[PDB]
Each structure stands twice: as structure tokens, then as C-alpha cells.
């Protein structure tokens, strides 16, 4: 007997860390066998894409190694030619410990110029960034600010700003530490 | 209040060694069911970090399939209403041919017996054949491909000399050994 598709397992919110496996389950009762298609943020997922393991006729979609760009709304749609099509939408929430994508480097700078030491980070939750000089918390002063980017800006660099610096980026899942870099002030 | 029904009978799941494999045991019930999993009628051991149970027990994922995972998997659903329900399927662990002991270079005295190894693993069991030069090796009075995969040459002749490789083949993939030199010495 011909039966219009029904999605018996609505899509859920899947929480996944970067580099983990994540699976959406879109089980379908219908006759005949449906064709199941998938979108991420309303863009079609190609089912021969090697980033996915697609199984049980498209009822199972598995991301083999989750990346931040996998975050979004996932929808499965079932069509078998009978009755009205059916869809279910859930979300993939990608979490990630902090990653320092642009760490600070060694800088030789003329005194009086502006030094900007990068500390670009990625993570979810959004990492908070702080700075170490030598082995202790940076005493932020008038010339020295930690920018929204995580960069350390030092206006009018002085000889006493010279030293060893590193940045620290943290969230609930972990902490990343940049290597020590040498700031040298040329006088 | 409703007794559990497994809406997705477990199937035969094929997976290569080192692939991810998932069993889907979708259950309709009220209250929410407890689902337990057994492999070969032994409760699934979660101290093995390779297992991942998701969506309230409805998904069992093996993160990296191994030969020992092969066998019969069952989910059972209990919610304290009516009878319990069970579904059993199988995991069949497959593997492309792997040449575990390939042929090596041999210098051998004419008239001696040469045995060039080609030990393989695979599921389906790989067929092994040999290449001398660019063309397929044809067996004869002196030359036989053994059941082990080895190339056995009785009464080695000067003409037998040359470059050999073995080829291991199943429906899933083909493995080629590196070409090796059979040098025949006449003293």
C-alpha cells in the first residue's frame, strides 16, 4: 500500500567538538522507499562528498571530522512520489577549545613607534585573551592595550617595554598558550 | 502511555577496518525507553573508547572499526510499559587487500628453487597474481602461484630473471607490491 513519507525521528540539536564524529538521524516510514536529501544552512549537501558517511538510504548522515564551518541548521527532506513531502530541521553546534591562529612573533622595533603583537584566536565559546610579560600578568598602562582582536598594542614603545611576551587564550573547554616571543626596543 | 516499538530494524552493516559504523535503533514509546546494546550477546563495553552511544541509545557508533567488532549486534528497548522489544543485525568487517609480506629482491643460483612471498590479508579473501615485466605471469611446469600467494619457481633459469610484483585483489580494492629484481646467478 502506497504511503506518503513520515519522518519518525525529528532532527535534534547535536553538540560536537571540532574533530569529532557527529550523526543526524532522519528515519523515514514510507512506501515506496523515499529519496532523502539534506541541506546545511539551506545549501545542498552532495551525498558523494567524502566528508560524510551517508547510510541507510540517506536516513543517516554522519560528519566524519567536524569542523567549525559545519555549524548550522541541518534539514532532511523525504520524497517518494506519494502525498506531500516532509522535512525535519535540527542544528549542529560546533564547540572548540581555543586555537591561536596568528601567535605573536619576535619583534625588533625602534623606540617611539607603535608595536602591535598579534594573538588571533578561534574557538567556541569565544576565547578571552590575556598577555604575559616575562612570567607575570601584563601591567596594562596608558600606552598599552589589549585590542578586541587579542593583539597587544603598545603606543610609543619604550626601552622598558622590551622583554619576553606570550598570549593566553581561554574558554570553558580549554586554554591555548602562545610561545614566548622577544620584544626588542632599538634606541 | 505506549509500549516500545523498534521502527528501524537493525540491518547488515558493512564497514572497512578503520571506518566509522553506525547502528540505528529508532524506538517509538512513552515514557522514553532505555535501550541496551549487546555484541554477540555480551553487553557493549563502554570502557572501550571506540564506542559512541547517541540520541538516547538509538544510535550506536563504532568510531574506528576493527576485525574483532565483526558479529551480531542487538538493541533492546524497555520503558516499563507492555513487553520489551529487540532487534538484531550484524556488522561485517571488510578490508581492502593488504600485502603484509611483499616480495623482496633476490639473487639466486641457477638451478635452485625460488620462492617470492606475497602474504596478504583482506575480506573478501584477496586473489593473488603475479606480474613479470609489464605482463601477467603465466604458470607452467616449473612455476606455480601457491595458496599462500607465494611465487614458487622450480629449477630457476637465466630467463626467469627480471622484475616481479604481486597483485592482491578483491571487490573492494587492489594492492600492488613494489617491483623487485630476481637476478639469476650462473657460476
Curated annotation (Swiss-Prot), chain B:
Induction summary: Up-regulated upon denervation (at protein level).
Ig-like domain span: 4-92, 97-181
Origin superkingdom: Eukaryota
Tissue-wise expression: Muscle specific.
SS bond partners: 25-75, 74-88, 118-166
Post-translational modification: Ubiquitinated by PDZRN3. Ubiquitination promotes endocytosis and lysosomal degradation.
Record's subcellular location: Postsynaptic cell membrane
Role of this protein: Receptor tyrosine kinase which plays a central role in the formation and the maintenance of the neuromuscular junction (NMJ), the synapse between the motor neuron and the skeletal muscle. Recruitment of AGRIN by LRP4 to the MUSK signaling complex induces phosphorylation and activation of MUSK, the kinase of the complex.
Quaternary structure (record): Monomer. Homodimer. Interacts with LRP4; the heterodimer forms an AGRIN receptor complex that binds AGRIN resulting in activation of MUSK. Forms a heterotetramer composed of 2 DOK7 and 2 MUSK molecules which facilitates MUSK trans-autophosphorylation on tyrosine residue and activation. Interacts (via cytoplasmic part) with DOK7 (via IRS-type PTB domain); requires MUSK phosphorylation. Interacts with DVL1 (via DEP domain); the interaction is direct and mediates the formation of a DVL1, MUSK and PAK1 ternary complex involved in AChR clustering.
The name this protein goes by in its record: Muscle, skeletal receptor tyrosine protein kinase
Gene expressing this chain: Musk
Parent-protein residues present: 25 to 211 of 868
Amino acid at each position: 500500500l502506497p504511503k506518503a513519507p513520515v519522518i519518525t525521528t525529528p532532527l535534534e540539536t547535536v553538540d560536537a567538538l571540532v574533530e569529532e564524529v557527529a550523526t543526524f538521524m532522519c528515519a523515514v516510514e514510507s512506501y515506496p522507499q523515499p529519496e532523502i536529501s539534506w541541506t546545511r544552512n539551506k545549501i545542498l549537501i552532495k551525498l558523494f562528498d567524502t566528508r560524510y558517511s551517508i547510510r541507510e538510504n540517506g536516513q543517516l548522515l554522519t560528519i566524519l571530522s567536524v569542523e567549525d564551518s559545519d555549524d548550522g541548521i541541518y534539514c532532511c527532506t523525504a520524497n517518494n512520489g506519494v502525498g506531500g513531502a516532509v522535512e525535519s530541521c535540527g542544528a549542529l553546534q560546533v564547540k572548540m577549545k581555543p586555537k591561536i591562529t596568528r601567535p605573536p612573533i619576535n619583534v625588533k622595533i625602534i623606540e617611539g613607534l607603535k608595536a602591535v603583537l598579534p594573538c588571533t584566536t578561534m574557538g567556541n565559546p569565544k576565547p578571552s585573551v590575556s598577555w604575559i610579560k616575562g612570567d607575570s600578568a601584563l601591567r596594562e598602562n596608558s600606552r598599552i592595550a589589549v585590542l578586541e582582536s587579542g593583539s597587544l598594542r603598545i603606543h610609543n614603545v619604550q626601552k622598558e617595554d622590551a622583554g619576553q611576551y606570550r598570549c593566553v587564550a581561554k574558554n570553558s573547554l580549554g586554554t591555548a598558550y602562545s610561545k614566548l616571543v622577544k620584544l626588542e626596543v632599538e634606541v
